[PDB]
Design a protein around this ligand. Structure first.
Ligand SMILES: CC(C)(C)c1cc(CCc2ccccn2)cc(-c2ccc(S(=O)(=O)CCO)cc2)c1
Length: 233
């Protein structure tokens, strides 16, 4: 156990309840690239862009467990992440939960941002014998007494989740499932609070360009790293 067990439960359950809904007009579809659909709502609070982002995608030949492991595992973070300048693991809470501090590349003309968040990976059992199991990574801001002092940075706050359900062809008697017959259905949600002044059109343009690039690059990277390796369901 650790002091955030209840908090992690609430944040994960909130995603399972609300984030997995189909978007079916309050979500604007902003970018479509094949099976990748990126939606957003335009929201500003006390002057600053909060725009909730939600994306679906469908990735052949990887499992949700694999996607979530690659997304969570700090040891491969630098192989796919292109927005971070530095990260530091502040605290380990469990084999599946850590607290990370990171600084991002500056988005001109706004100040550089930093972020301090708990990152957790969980498997959520099928709601009924008829539903898929879900693997989820949730990255959500927390406070911490060993927060770094970084005067060049404004502190952003995030609530992100990478949510995956995996569909397979069943095994034909004594024969494994091939990666050809697996499909990972992703819902990715990102609620980022810049934590201070930033110009709305720039944030919007950057989100619209960079989220699709991120999803494409990260999902390709998982396919590339898992090709020809045993499936980890
Ligand atoms: C422009 C905007 C899209 C809002 C934005 C700006 C910045 C840079 C820091 C920042 C935030 C706000 C304003 C200025 N700079 C970071 C993020 C962000 C952070 C973390 C995650 S994650 O999925 O946990 C890793 C994804 O690669 C995703 C996106 C988004």
């Amino acid at each position: 156990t650790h002091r955030f067990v209840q908090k992690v439960e609430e944040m994960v359950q909130n995603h399972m309840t609300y984030s997995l809904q189909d978007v079916g007009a309050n979500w604007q579809l902003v970018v479509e690239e094949g099976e990748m659909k990126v939606y957003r709502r335009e929201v500003e609070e006390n002057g600053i862009v909060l725009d909730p982002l939600k994306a679906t995608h469908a990735v052949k030949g990887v499992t949700g467990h694999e996607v979530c492991n690659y997304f969570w595992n700090v040891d491969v973070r630098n192989d796919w992440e292109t927005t971070i300048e530095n990260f530091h693991v502040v605290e380990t809470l469990a084999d599946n939960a850590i607290i990370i501090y990171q600084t991002h590349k500056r988005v001109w003309p706004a100040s550089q941002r930093d972020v301090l968040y708990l990152s957790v990976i969980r498997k959520i059992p099928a709601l009924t014998e008829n539903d898929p199991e879900t693997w989820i990574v949730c990255n959500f801001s927390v406070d911490h007494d060993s927060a770094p002092l970084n005067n060049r940075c404004v502190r952003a706050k995030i609530n992100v989740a990478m949510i995956c359900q995996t569909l397979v062809s069943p095994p034909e008697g004594n024969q494994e499932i091939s990666r050809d017959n697996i499909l990972c259905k992703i819902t990715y949600v990102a609620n980022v609070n810049p934590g201070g002044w930033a110009p709305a059109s720039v944030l919007r343009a950057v989100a619209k360009r960079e989220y699709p690039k991120f999803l494409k690059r990260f999902t390709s990277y998982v396919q590339e790293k898992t090709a020809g390796k045993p499936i980890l369901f």
